[PDB]
Amino acid sequence: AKLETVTLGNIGKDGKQTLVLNPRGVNPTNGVASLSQAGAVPALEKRVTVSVSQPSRNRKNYKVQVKIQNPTACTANGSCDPSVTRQAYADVTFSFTQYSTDEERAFVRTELAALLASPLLIDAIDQLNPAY
Amino acid sequence: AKLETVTLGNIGKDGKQTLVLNPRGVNPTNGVASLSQAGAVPALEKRVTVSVSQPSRNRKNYKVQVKIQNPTACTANGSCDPSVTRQAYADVTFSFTQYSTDEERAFVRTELAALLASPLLIDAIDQLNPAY
Amino acid sequence: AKLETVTLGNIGKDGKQTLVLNPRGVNPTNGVASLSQAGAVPALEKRVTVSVSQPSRNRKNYKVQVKIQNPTACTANGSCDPSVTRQAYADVTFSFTQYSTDEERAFVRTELAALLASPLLIDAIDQLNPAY
Amino acid sequence: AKLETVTLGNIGKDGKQTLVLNPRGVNPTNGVASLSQAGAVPALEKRVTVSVSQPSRNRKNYKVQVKIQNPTACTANGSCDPSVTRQAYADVTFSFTQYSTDEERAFVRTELAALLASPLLIDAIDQLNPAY
Amino acid sequence: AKLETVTLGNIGKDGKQTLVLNPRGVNPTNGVASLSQAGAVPALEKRVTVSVSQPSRNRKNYKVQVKIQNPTACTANGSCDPSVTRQAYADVTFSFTQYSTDEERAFVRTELAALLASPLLIDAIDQLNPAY
Amino acid sequence: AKLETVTLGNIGKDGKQTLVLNPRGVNPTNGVASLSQAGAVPALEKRVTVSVSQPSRNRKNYKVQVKIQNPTACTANGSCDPSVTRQAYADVTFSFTQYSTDEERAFVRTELAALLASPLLIDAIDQLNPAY
């Protein structure tokens, strides 16, 4: 990565749609890669922001982070320009020790993806169901 | 949503192992369940903690958080007690408003699992190679 | 050079529209051509300007500058007049040394037109879209 | 955007030559596209680069900046080695609002290509004729 | 000249060792490419960094610079965590004239590799002193 | 590490070139050994020089300075005093601790020569740096 385009498929409530984010680029103060929705509305686009520490000494207990932004907008009466009335977010971090291996980093990655995909969280999030 | 066990299949570097979590120690203060490997001490070491959000009050929105902790164990000779260091962690959160819908929630979480499975994050996590 | 109505055919993302900017004149304040389309208010909005800077005592080489003004307008309320909320524009400079010739002057114009036609700028402008 | 070799054909005084600008890696410290006549000595090299940026601190619009350079050298100017004697450049900046469509952004891009081909600029640029 | 996996071989004291370097991408902090071995395993740092410099307005220095970091660790008896006691380094810089060509630049690089492998430089640091 | 004439071959971008440098003795004030060209004018000679030591009170550790100087000149802007013209230059610094082993030093020398011989750097010093 090296990614010219990022496509997430099998998404949405029924697991049937796709989202294409194109890289905008990498931010040269932050060292942060940034993707956003391929649709032509810069004002109102889905975004993914990605960072990994060098690691530097104070970032040796390194972070890998992805920020997810999904605004929802509509057009107000009397305004040709649409705007966001609600926003949805997610924020995921790893890892953090310098002595972790790719295998452990992956377990955390997948013990996560496999949980996000599990009914516990599907209903705890989609219907705001307390666990009991 | 329910304090049922979770089978996290298809996990690890190649997506081929399984870990099973069993919820316990739910703290009524905040409705947060500790999901962990069932049995002995590893049950205390390898765990995922899951909160469930509820709308409004603080404020006109809500937040969901899951904490992942996977410690590395070893022990001194003659010790009565093993210990863990070089611990792997992750944190995933979600944020939505009080008027949010199920469809926008589904995209934020369904993307996220698809996003974790994307080379974007596989490289950012497994190698620590950000998409540069 | 001498002004005449400039008709720009085959324009817009689909290459189907035509813009017609009449040779209103040249502003003697600064030697700037004024080309516009057509109405009492719209001609003050849809505009192209042109000027030439000759080599000079300020130890300057020569250049040609072209400005593109493409504002649009939206809604109106009880105050009744419409207004511009958005504007697309460009500032186009052609820079040459004092001994530069016609061939070089022509290459810069045509290379740019070829580049504007090329996918690199189709995507830089229609999409996000910085390199990568 | 994505880089690939661009062949800027139908260029120059008679509209008959081609520049073949091969992709160069994109340096993240600015995210600038770089295509060039790579067989050239770097002090000569004919090159096209594109800089694209999003709104940020002190910046409200989206911008695309295009730089075209064509230095020309004398192969052996009383020497054995080439030395640049002539230079010619394009420096074009485009600017768009965040809420904007591709159709609209494209008009400024396409209008310029159509404009570059106009008799007004053929004379304003190739003969360096002032407006009149 | 591009991000790629680099495999070395026929290296080491007996000339029989191999090494594979997995890229980290290009770091926006300074626009510099880097690659490391596993790269997840060498928690104690095994790295190669490659510049990527530009013929800047204030320098015209588009040099190639490669930095090599090779630590050696000691295990503190019954330790769960090994640590570096020695660090070896190498730093190679290639300085160029702006009118230089590929064969000129290659003469120096190929000359250097041929020299590093020569008995004179091998003896000076394998066992001895400044040459005599 | 006695200086003796060093003959290099299989050098240049195509690996088709030789170079012979003869000992000129050693600079006694800094231990900088030198291999000279067989010509009459030092200004235009290709040469290689070397010195290795651990300073008594700038220590740190042991470092070696390996330097390549390749001046170029031509008689057209000559023939008298055909000055430089395409100067090429490179060097290597290596450093080791007092405990570095014999194989450690060998490893680093060979790792570097193997990298210099790698396609990554073969192309980096030529027409394109690994900006991406």
Author numbering:
A (entry chain M), B (entry chain F), C (entry chain O), D (entry chain H), E (entry chain K), F (entry chain D): 1 to 132
Share the article's original sentences.
The coat proteins (CPs) of single-stranded RNA bacteriophages (ssRNA phages) directly assemble around the genomic RNA (gRNA) to form a near-icosahedral capsid with a single maturation protein (Mat) that binds the gRNA and interacts with the retractile pilus during infection of the host. The canonical ssRNA phage Qβ has a genomic RNA (gRNA) of 4217 nucleotides, from the 5′ to the 3′ end, encoding the maturation protein (Mat); the major coat protein (CP); the minor capsid protein A1, which is a read-through extension caused by a leaky stop codon for the major CP; and the β-subunit of the RNA-dependent RNA replicase (Rep). Like many other viruses, the CPs of ssRNA phages can also assemble into virus-like particles (VLPs), which are not infectious.
Further structural characterization of these smaller particles revealed two previously unreported forms of VLPs. When produced from an infection event, and purified via size-exclusion chromatography, the population of the oblate and the small prolate forms are around 21% and 3%, respectively. When over-expressing the gene containing only the cp and read-through (referred to as A1) fraction of the Qβ genome from a plasmid, the percentage of the oblate and small prolate forms increase further to 35% and 12%, respectively. For example, one can convert an oblate capsid to a T = 3 capsid by separating the two end-shells from the equator and adding five more hexamers where the two half-shells rejoin. Our results, showing that over-expressing the 987-nt cp/A1 gene leads to more percentages of the oblate (from 21% to 35%) and the small prolate (from 3% to 12%) forms, suggest the length of the RNA being encapsidated may affect the ratio of different forms of the VLPs.
